[PDB]
Amino acid sequence: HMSICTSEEWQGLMQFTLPVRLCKEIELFHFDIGPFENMWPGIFVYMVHRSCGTSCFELEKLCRFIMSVKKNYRRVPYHNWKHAVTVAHCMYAILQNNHTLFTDLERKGLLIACLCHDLDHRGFSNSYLQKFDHPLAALYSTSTMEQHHFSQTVSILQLEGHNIFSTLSSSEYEQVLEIIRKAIIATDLALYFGNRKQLEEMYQTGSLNLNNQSHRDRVIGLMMTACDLCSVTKLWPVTKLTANDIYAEFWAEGDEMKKLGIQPIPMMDRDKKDEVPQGQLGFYNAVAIPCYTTLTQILPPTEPLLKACRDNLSQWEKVIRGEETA
Template sequence: MILASISMFVELGLVKKFSIERETLYRFLMTIKKNYRDVPYHNWRHAFNVAQVMFAILMGCEMKGTFSDLEVLGMFVGCLCHDLDHRGTNNAYQQKAGSALVLLYGTTNTMEHHHFNHSVMILSSENLNIFSSLSAECYSAVMNVLKHSILATDLSTYFQHRTRFFKLVESREYSWGIEEHRELLRSMLMTASDIAASSKPWEVQQRVAHLVTAEFLSQGDKERQELNLQPQALMDRERQHELPKLQIRWIADICLPLYQSLGQMNPKLSVMADGALENMKHWDSLARKSEQNNSSFK
């Protein structure tokens, strides 16, 4: 994954364009990897997968030209860094548990602020700063894109912005020359890459769904045992059998509308919606089977 990340930096033209020293890039990537925790889902592998999807979108869907090199740099590094030091618990949990992170960053985008700050801490270490050749102006521009990209991975941010994006695409009023529109597209591509597991081949989708579930259930256990709270369905060990039904809702309500809108904007991105629809069929047949099993027990 480290080697593949280096290849992607090179193929995106970032190493050359921003005179990134190879040794610094190696150290940076090794440090990023080390700063992900050993949790079931939000670990280095997830960060790598997100970066790989972003790479595929930028290179394979003729999207690279839509953005400046600085934006590509900020988004790609943003993908690698977007869940740094994740503890396997979400923003709602930080608030319920009154964690130190809430005291530090407040209740809006709590974890995402932490992921960004963690990235800044790594980037500002002298021998890890892959942005060191940038002028002061470019440095501050790339940090802005980085921050924006990481904060965009909070689904509550996605919900705030998606209606505007969908409308722009629907009415064909978007123009990537307009800064605000491009910023919106960057946000949507970050989310699309982050949740892309739902668009992948069924074997991958199923494996990832079980990893996410393992992490959610362990948060649910903590809520029940340590905070004396009833966890929501998704995180409730006693309702594990509802996974197929919950996956269908996750894909239909959150993933599919985004993939469809992106596909409308760029037909090459339709593969994401196609993959998600295919996975919904699989989850649906599992949901039916589990219903039949339940009724035969009664």
């Protein structure tokens, strides 16, 4: 099922060295990997090593894992390899800024989860899959694609010489797969609404306790949401360019629905682009802003993401007022 990287791909990755100038910039939240496509795999290797240590993973296995994961992301407009690395970098930044709050096991697992969270995405949402009795919606009744993404992750790990977690004790092994499982499922936005309200409630009543595994799971879940949506925390021009990619997939889905005799929601209707600005305002107010607000409360060092998100919210309002530019 899973595609496999060539020997030239993983072998070449092992010899990669991150340019000195980027070492500085990669630590910042607003960092945009966009202008460095050839370096994305190497950037991930770098983040893993800085966060988890150069010997955490056997280099050969890690490189095969990375290049195969890349080969298993499809050439879709948004849920692609570029997105995977973007999300992993946000997680890297969050972990670097809250290092000792998370275990070595969790950091390894979360960085890997972020790189694999949208594995083998076809370009169709859970709505489509369920509303069209796709085999996946039957196998996975809820969080359909997310369960599939996790399934894909384990399949890659099982490929020969690809299991980077085998050196963990039998106990930590199962523990890390559970961390990855929950983390990937948490990227199902449907689950975000409940998770955020819960955390907010926990935080304000003073109940939140990081030594409480159920609370840890929720915090990690919000972190995944935060990283998944981080394109809204970049400089405006970057945020805007990514938005076009997001909508390219939305509109493509809408077109397929029309062909199947079912009118799509406005957001997925390429004939209703005029409604995009207002729709983004809604998404920021109902999802992005609350997410980063709650995350900042729990992990103060992540405040730059909230500030950036608010700045972009202001940009969308500026568009609606007819003051946009370029």
